[PDB]
Each structure stands twice: as structure tokens, then as C-alpha cells.
Structure 1
Amino acid sequence: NLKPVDAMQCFDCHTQIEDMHTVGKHATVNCVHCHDATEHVETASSRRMGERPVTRMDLEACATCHTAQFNSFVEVRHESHPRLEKATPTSRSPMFDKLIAGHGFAFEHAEPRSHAFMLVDHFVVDRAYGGRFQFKNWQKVTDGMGAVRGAWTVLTDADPESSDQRRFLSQTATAANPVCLNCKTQDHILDWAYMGDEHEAAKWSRTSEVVEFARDLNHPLNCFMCHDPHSAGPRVVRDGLINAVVDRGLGTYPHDPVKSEQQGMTKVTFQRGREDFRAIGLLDTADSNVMCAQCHVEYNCNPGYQLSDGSRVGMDDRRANHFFWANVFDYKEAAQEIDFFDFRHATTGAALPKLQHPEAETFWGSVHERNGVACADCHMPKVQLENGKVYTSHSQRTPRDMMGQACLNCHAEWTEDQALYAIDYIKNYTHGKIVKSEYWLAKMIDLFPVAKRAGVSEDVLNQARELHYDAHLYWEWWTAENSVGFHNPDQARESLMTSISKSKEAVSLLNDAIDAQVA
């Protein structure tokens, strides 16, 4: 059985924790729930750690007193189809392979599934670790509770004796790097310096050997990613988000200075010796928009190249861990600001951005966001009980599963079928424009080889490549983003029409140029 420790003795050296712990709703929760500090206490001074105390990162550390939240979190939504490749006619991006050619996502890009699986899915996807990590067998794919208990309880490593990124299966890539893991786990929260900069006190950084790093991580979406363990109050821990909101002064709501001030973030830094080491962002309110934006954003988490001169931007560069914190119409400027692109298209040679799940930046300015609605209202609502103590569902999933709580309490004028119909009207319309955007991108792409081989000038090919950047951005934002336009239907529509416009412009340019050479 756990035996409580003398927290007051801890506090003689830990005033920062004291001030958080003694004031919040965990004031009575003894350190022994999350820390084994016995040898630490025997060997430390206020200026010397001595033995490193153990800190529990497992979600069960919280489940003991908060089983309902834990259980709701770990639930697997079987209706969220697993390992479903997006580059197929029946998924999100029927022409993705053509359009994304030259990028690692061509190796595999599945639809998201339940949060329990995020770390294991990151480990086993064909694009990440060259097929090194796999589920122990094909039965383990169901095991959300097992994944939560730990990745390495359900996975195997093809070669425990080497730590290099390489291909074990032919059609894989090795895109994973340490920045990725920050959106899969925070098991490394005490072993990773802010932004993954090099640091004397950090075991892990942006430049670590990712296979070695992987082996030290176990749990997905730690409960403390949104909740300070000491104060119990709302926070974020993700460095990239704190960097955008606070360091760069952009605010929690870049488009609304007032809401940014009312629903802000306070950066708190923790030192190792005399040096700043790690940081968290305490939230003014329990604002799920910002909590969820720890991961559901467009980001850099990868090397790339400079727009200016094409040179490599490696993981050692701060730009390899970056939240753009920009909506679709501000993104190109944001990328120019850091002089960065992701890949060169394999067919067109255009420098292109790679977009990822920009839900947070898409939701900005939408009718719901402007009305003070937040991600949790639709995706993790309060439970409604005929008799019971209310709690917040932590099963982050489509509102289709809980429409009464997620939509209909607000939209009293609608039945469930009407509400679903409204969602589907937007998604259907948006998807049509995604498909049309891809048709026109593909049409442009296919003209590049013809143009090149016809002797069209580099000047003209470069003009077309500049069009490709925009045509790509204004399309891929929406295949990346998970709501199929629902989060911001007017923005999706404007963007996709812009993509098509740009592709059409490039198609005409290239066709005319080819025809001129003939011729």
C-alpha cells in the first residue's frame, strides 16, 4: 500500500511546487502518488539533486482517484475504422499519391483512430521507422488498454541490437524524429528541454537517435498534458504551442486580442541548476481549444529546406519544431517568415509545404468559435445522467456518438437527423471541392513531364511551380484537416476554390507553352 511522505520536507527545497500544490485541488494529494523520492530525500541538498527521484508518467497514476475520466479516455471507438489509408478512392484523398509524390506520407497515411493508440500507431505506421516496430501480432491492434499500459507491452522491435533508422520492409520510410513524439506522449517531460534544444540536463533532444528515444517512451496522451499534476489546474505542456502563443506573442486567439487576454496562457519555467530547462503554459480558463491545439495543429516536426536558397534545414534547427499558428490564408506568409518548405514534388519539382491536421487554426473565426464554443463541447461533453455526479467525458470522438450532449442541447430546433444532415451537407460539399481540387492539381502535375520533354523553358516551369505551391496549400489544408470543412465551411470553400483557380492557371500556362513548342 502507498505510504504518504512528508510533503513539507519536500517543500523546503521545492517552493515552486509548494506554491502550486498547496493552493489547488490537489493540496491533499500526497507526492507518493506520482513520485518515489526516498533516496532523493536521503541524498539531496537544495542545490544538488542527489539521487534522481522517480516520477510516474502512467495514466493509472490518475485513474486511481479519477477512474471515470480514465475509463472514458481509454475507450476504443471501433466504428473509427483502423489503419484506413487516406490515398484510396473511398477515403479522404483519392489522388494523394500523385499529389504528395516526393513526401514520406506516400508510404502510408491512415485516418486517425482513438487516442489510446496514438503512440503505438506512430511507432508502427509504414512511414515512420522503416517497419522496425510492429504489433506483436495482428490481434494486438484491438488492445487500447494495453497500448495505454505501455507501447512496448503490445509491440516488438525488429532489431533490439541496433538503434539506427533503417528500412526493414521495402516500402517504408524513416520519417520519425524526436519532435514527433511530443504529440504522442509526454513521458519525456522531465528529459527534454524546451523546444528540444540541446541542453546539459536533457537526455533527449531534436537531434537524438529517435529509435533510442522511442524505446524509452510508453504512454499515450498523458493525463497531465492538460492538467497540472500539482495544482490540478488547466494547462498545456507542448513546447511548440507555448512558443507560438507566448514567446512569439501571437496569443491564444491570434485573431481576437480580447479573447486572447481573457483566455490566456502564463508561461512557467522550471530550471535545472541555474538554467531554464522546461516550461508549461498555465491557462486562465479550462480552454479545450488551446488544450487540443497541443497537437491538432499544422506544424513542423521534421527537416526541410529553405525557400530562399533550397538549403537543408535539419533537426538541429529550431525550425524543425515549429507551430505556425496561422490560418490557411496566413500560412504561406508564416512559412516565408521562417524561410521553410517541406519537400520538392517528385514530378513537378515545385517546393511545397506539407500540411498536417490544422483543426485549431481552421476553427478560428468560425461561427462556433466566435460564439464561444470549444472543441470539448462537441468532442468531449459533459455526461448527462438521470441520477449521478456529473463528469466530463474524456472519450474524444465524433459528436455523432453523443449528439444530444454535443449538439442538440444547443440546437433545440433540430432533431438528431436534422443535425446530422447539416453536418453532411457541409462535408459532402467540401469533399466535392477537395475532389475537384485534386482533379485540377493532377491535371497540372501531369503536364509537367510533357512540358519538360517538349522543351518548355525553366522560366515557365518555375512560374508553374510557384502556382503549384499555392494550389497545393489551398487543397492539402483540407485533406489534412479532419472535419471535412465542418469546422469552418466558408473558409474551406474559399480555399478550395482558390486551389482550383491556381491549378487552372498553371494548366493553361503549361498547355499554351507546350503548344507553342509544338508550334
Structure 2
Amino acid sequence: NLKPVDAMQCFDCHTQIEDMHTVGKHATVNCVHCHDATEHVETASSRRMGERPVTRMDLEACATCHTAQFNSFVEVRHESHPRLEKATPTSRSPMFDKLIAGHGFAFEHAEPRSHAFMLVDHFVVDRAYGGRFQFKNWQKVTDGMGAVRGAWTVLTDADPESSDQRRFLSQTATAANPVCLNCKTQDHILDWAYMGDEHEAAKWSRTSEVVEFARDLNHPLNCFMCHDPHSAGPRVVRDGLINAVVDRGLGTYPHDPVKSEQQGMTKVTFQRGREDFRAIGLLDTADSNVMCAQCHVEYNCNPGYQLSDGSRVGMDDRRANHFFWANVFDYKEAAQEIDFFDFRHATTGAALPKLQHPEAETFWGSVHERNGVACADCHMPKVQLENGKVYTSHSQRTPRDMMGQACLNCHAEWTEDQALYAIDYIKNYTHGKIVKSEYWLAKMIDLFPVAKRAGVSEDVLNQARELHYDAHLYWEWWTAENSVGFHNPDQARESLMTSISKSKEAVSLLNDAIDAQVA
């Protein structure tokens, strides 16, 4: 059984924690619930850590007193189809292989599934670690509770004796790097300096061997990613988000200065040997839009190239950990601002961006966002009970599973079937424009080899490559984003019509040039 420690003894050194812990709703929660610090207390000084205390990061540390929220979080939605490849006729992006050729996502890009699996899915996907990590057997794919307990309880490593990234199966890639892990776990929260910069006090950084880093990590989406464990108050911990909102002064709602002030973030920094080490962002309100934007954003978490001169931008560069914090129509300017692109297309040779699930940036300025609605209202609402103490659902999933609470409470004029029909109208329309954008992108891409072999000039091909950047951006945003237009239907429509317009311009350019060479 746990025995309480004297928190006042801790507070003699730890004044920042004292200020947070004594004032919030965890003021009676003893340190022993999360820390084993006996040898630390015996050896520390005011400035030196001495022996390192143990800090629990397992979700079960919170489950003892908050079983309802924990059980809700670890639920597996079996209807969220698992390991479902997006590059197939029946999924999100039928022509993805042709359009993304030259990028690691071509090796595998499945649809998302329940949060319990995020860290194991990162480790096992074919594009990440060359197939090094696998489930112990095919039965383990169901075990959300096991994944939560720890990744290495359900996975194997093909070669525990080496730590290099290499292919163990032929059709895999080795795209993973330490920055990726910040959106899968925060087990490394005390071992990683802000932004992943080199630091004397950091075990891990942007330049670490990712296989060794992986082996040190266990838990998905720790409870403390949104809740400070000392104050119990709302926060974010993700460095790139704090960098965009606070360091670069963009605010929590870059399109709305007033909302940014009412619903802002305060950066708190913790030091090692009196040098800045790590940081968190305390929130003015319990604002899920900003909590969820720790991960559901467009980002850099990878090496790339400069638009200016084509030169390599490696993991050592700050640009390898970056939140653009820009909507689709501001993105090109944002990428030019840091002089960066992701890959060169394998067929066209065009410099292209790679887009990541931009739900937060897409939600800005939408009808629901402008009306004060937030991600949690639709995806993790309050539970309704005939008799019982209300709590917030932590099962982040589609509103279709809870339409009464997610939609119909605001939309009294609708039945459930009417609300679903409204969602499907938008998704069906948006998906048709994604498919049409792919048709025109593919038509343009296929003309590049014909043009090159016909002797079309580099000047004309380069003009077409410049159009490919825009045609790609204004399409891929929408296959990357998970709502199939629902989060901002008018923006999706304008963007996809732009993609098609750009591809058509490029098709006309190339066909005319081919025809002139032939004549």
C-alpha cells in the first residue's frame, strides 16, 4: 500500500510545483501517487538533481481515482476499420500511389483507428521502421488495454542487437524519427528539451537514433497531455504548438484576436541547472480546440529540402519540428516563410509539400467554430445519465455513435436520420471533388514522361512543376483531413476547385508543347 510523503519537504526546493499543487484540485493528492523520490530527497541540492526520482507516466496512475474517464478513453471502437489502406478504390484516396510517388507514405498509409493504438500503430506501420517492429502475433491487434499498458507488452523487435534504421521486409520505408513520437506519447516529457534541441539535460533530441528512442517509450496519449498533474488544470505540452501560439505570437485563434485573448495560453518553463529545459502551455479555459491541436494539425516532423536552392534540411534543423499554424489558403506562404518542401515527385520532378491531418486549421472560421463549438462537443461530449454523476466521455470518436449528445441537443429541429443525412450530403459532395481532383492530377502526371520523351523544353516542364505544387496542395489537404469536408465545407469546395483549375492549366500547357514538338 502507498505511504504518503512529506510534500512540504519537496516544496522547500520545488517552489514552482508548490505554487501549482497547493492551489488547484489536486492539492490533497500526495506526490507518492506519481513519484518515488526517497533517494532523490537524500541526495539533491537546491540546484542539482542528485539521484533521479522515478515519475510514473502510465495512464493507470490516474485511473485509481478517475476510473470512469480511463475506461472511456481505452474503449476500442471496433467499427473503426483497422489497418485499412487509403490508396484503394474503396477508401479516401484511390489514386494516392500515382500522386504521392516519391514519398514514404506510398509504402503504407492506413485510416486512423481508436487512440489506444496510436503508439503501437506508429511502431508497426510499413512506412516507419522498415518492418522491424511487429505485433507478437495477429491476435494482439485487438488488445487496446494491452497497448495502453505498454507497447512492448504486445510487440516484438526483429533484431534487439542492432539500433540502425534498415529494411527487414522489402516493401517498407524508414520514415520514423524522434519528432514523430511527440504526437504518439509523452513518456519522454522529462527527457526531451523544448523543440528537441540539443541540451545537456536531454537524453533524447531530434538527432537521436530513433530505434533506441522507440524502445524507451510505452504509453499512448498520456492523460497529462491535456491536464497538468499538479494543478489538474487544462494545458498543452506539445512543443511545436507552444512555439506557434506563444513564441511566434500567432495566438490560439490566429484569425480572431479577441477569442485568442479570452482563450489564451501561458507558457511555463522548467529549468535544469538554471538553464531553460522544457515548457508547457497553461490554458485560460478547458478549450479542446487547442488540446486536440497538439496533434491534429499540419506539421513538419521530418527532413526535407529548401525551395530556394534545393539543399537538404536535416533533423538537426529547427524546421524538422514545426507547426505551420496556417489554413490551406495561407499554407504556401507559410512554407515559403521557412523556405521548405517535403519531396520531389518521382514522375514529374516537382518540389511538393506533404500534408498531415489538418483538422485544427480547417476548423478555423467554420460555421461551428464561429459559434463557439469545439472538437469535444462533437467528439467527446458529456455523458447523459437518468441518475448519476455526470462526467465527460473520453472516447474520442465519430458523433454517429452518440448523435443525441453530439448533434441533436443543439439541433432540436432534426431527427437522428436527418442529422446523418446532412453530414452525408457534405461528405458525398466533397469526396466527388477529391476524386475529380485526382483524375486531373493523374492526367497531368502521365503527360510528364510523354513531354520529356518528345523533347519539351526544361522551361515548359518547370512551369508545369510550379503548377503541380498548387494542384497537389489544394487536393492533398482534403485526403489528409479526416472529416471529408464536414469541418469546413465551403473551404473544401473552393480548395478542390482550385486544385482542378491548376491541373487543367498544366494539362493544357503540356499537351500544347508536346503537339508543337511533334509538328
- Where on the TM-score scale, by shorter chain, does this alignment land: which range? over 0.9
Give the secondary-structure state (helix, strand or coil) at the position aligned to 2:138.
coil
Please report how far the alpha carbon of residue 416 of structure 1 lies from its aligned counterpart in structure 2 after TM superposition: 0.4
Give the secondary-structure state (helix, strand or coil) at the position aligned to 1:179.
helix
TM-score normalised over the length of structure 1: 1.00
Cα distance in 2 between the residues matched to 1:63 and 1:508: 61
Is contact 2:178-2:210 (8 Å) kept?
yes
Cα distance in 1 between the residues matched to 2:152 and 2:90: 33
Cα distance in 1 between the residues matched to 2:129 and 2:86: 19
CA deviations 1:58-101 (Å, max 9, x no partner) are 00000000000000000000000000000000000000000000
Please report how far the alpha carbon of residue 47 of structure 1 lies from its aligned counterpart in structure 2 after TM superposition: 1.6
Give the secondary-structure state (helix, strand or coil) at the position aligned to 2:490.
helix
Give the secondary-structure state (helix, strand or coil) at the position aligned to 1:467.
helix
Please report how far the alpha carbon of residue 259 of structure 1 lies from its aligned counterpart in structure 2 after TM superposition: 0.3
Please report how far the alpha carbon of residue 177 of structure 1 lies from its aligned counterpart in structure 2 after TM superposition: 0.2
CA deviations 1:403-450 (Å, max 9, x no partner) are 000000000000000000000000000000000000000000000000
Please report how far the alpha carbon of residue 320 of structure 1 lies from its aligned counterpart in structure 2 after TM superposition: 0.3
Give the secondary-structure state (helix, strand or coil) at the position aligned to 1:281.
strand
Cα distance in 2 between the residues matched to 1:3 and 1:517: 84
Cα distance in 1 between the residues matched to 2:306 and 2:458: 20
What are the within-5 Å matches in structure 2 for residues 98-497 of structure 1?
A: 98-497=98-497
Cα distance in 2 between the residues matched to 1:411 and 1:58: 39
Is contact 2:226-2:236 (8 Å) kept?
yes
Give the secondary-structure state (helix, strand or coil) at the position aligned to 2:214.
helix
Please report how far the alpha carbon of residue 274 of structure 1 lies from its aligned counterpart in structure 2 after TM superposition: 1.4
Cα distance in 2 between the residues matched to 1:278 and 1:214: 20
Please report how far the alpha carbon of residue 244 of structure 1 lies from its aligned counterpart in structure 2 after TM superposition: 0.3
Cα distance in 1 between the residues matched to 2:327 and 2:128: 27
Runs (4+) of structure 1 exceeding 4 A deviation are: none
Give the secondary-structure state (helix, strand or coil) at the position aligned to 1:183.
coil
Cα distance in 2 between the residues matched to 1:3 and 1:343: 55
Identity of aligned residues (%): 100
CA deviations 1:131-158 (Å, max 9, x no partner) are 0000000000000000000000000000
Please report how far the alpha carbon of residue 28 of structure 1 lies from its aligned counterpart in structure 2 after TM superposition: 0.4
Please report how far the alpha carbon of residue 194 of structure 1 lies from its aligned counterpart in structure 2 after TM superposition: 0.2
Please report how far the alpha carbon of residue 484 of structure 1 lies from its aligned counterpart in structure 2 after TM superposition: 0.2
| Count of aligned pairs | 519
Cα distance in 2 between the residues matched to 1:262 and 1:440: 44
Cα distance in 1 between the residues matched to 2:476 and 2:167: 27
Give the secondary-structure state (helix, strand or coil) at the position aligned to 2:279.
strand
Please report how far the alpha carbon of residue 128 of structure 1 lies from its aligned counterpart in structure 2 after TM superposition: 0.1
Cα distance in 2 between the residues matched to 1:484 and 1:443: 23
What are the within-5 Å matches in structure 2 for residues 33-112 of structure 1?
A: 33-112=33-112
Please report how far the alpha carbon of residue 45 of structure 1 lies from its aligned counterpart in structure 2 after TM superposition: 1.3
Is contact 2:47-2:274 (8 Å) kept?
no
Please report how far the alpha carbon of residue 490 of structure 1 lies from its aligned counterpart in structure 2 after TM superposition: 0.2
TM-score normalised over the length of structure 2: 1.00
CA deviations 1:182-201 (Å, max 9, x no partner) are 00000000000000000000
Please report how far the alpha carbon of residue 46 of structure 1 lies from its aligned counterpart in structure 2 after TM superposition: 1.1
Please report how far the alpha carbon of residue 502 of structure 1 lies from its aligned counterpart in structure 2 after TM superposition: 0.2
Cα distance in 1 between the residues matched to 2:516 and 2:228: 65
Cα distance in 2 between the residues matched to 1:91 and 1:357: 16
Cα distance in 2 between the residues matched to 1:278 and 1:100: 36
Residue of structure 2 equivalent to 1:7: 7
Which ranges of structure 1 fall in alignment gaps of 5 or more residues?
none
CA deviations 1:265-297 (Å, max 9, x no partner) are 000000001110000000000000000000000
Is contact 2:470-2:502 (8 Å) kept?
yes
Cα distance in 1 between the residues matched to 2:327 and 2:401: 29
Give the secondary-structure state (helix, strand or coil) at the position aligned to 1:156.
strand
CA deviations 1:204-256 (Å, max 9, x no partner) are 00000000000000000000000000000000000000000000000000000
Cα distance in 2 between the residues matched to 1:324 and 1:49: 36
Cα distance in 1 between the residues matched to 2:451 and 2:386: 68
Please report how far the alpha carbon of residue 48 of structure 1 lies from its aligned counterpart in structure 2 after TM superposition: 1.5
Is contact 2:468-2:503 (8 Å) kept?
yes
Aligned-residue Cα RMSD (Å) equals: 0.3
Cα distance in 1 between the residues matched to 2:474 and 2:122: 26
Give the secondary-structure state (helix, strand or coil) at the position aligned to 2:460.
helix
Is contact 2:456-2:514 (8 Å) kept?
yes
Please report how far the alpha carbon of residue 163 of structure 1 lies from its aligned counterpart in structure 2 after TM superposition: 0.3
CA deviations 1:166-190 (Å, max 9, x no partner) are 0000000000000000000000000
Cα distance in 2 between the residues matched to 1:69 and 1:89: 38
Is contact 2:150-2:218 (8 Å) kept?
yes
Give the secondary-structure state (helix, strand or coil) at the position aligned to 1:12.
helix
Cα distance in 2 between the residues matched to 1:488 and 1:46: 52
Cα distance in 1 between the residues matched to 2:166 and 2:181: 18
Please report how far the alpha carbon of residue 501 of structure 1 lies from its aligned counterpart in structure 2 after TM superposition: 0.2
Give the secondary-structure state (helix, strand or coil) at the position aligned to 2:276.
strand
Give the secondary-structure state (helix, strand or coil) at the position aligned to 1:141.
helix
Cα distance in 1 between the residues matched to 2:272 and 2:492: 45
Cα distance in 1 between the residues matched to 2:237 and 2:128: 24
Please report how far the alpha carbon of residue 393 of structure 1 lies from its aligned counterpart in structure 2 after TM superposition: 0.2
Cα distance in 2 between the residues matched to 1:240 and 1:14: 26
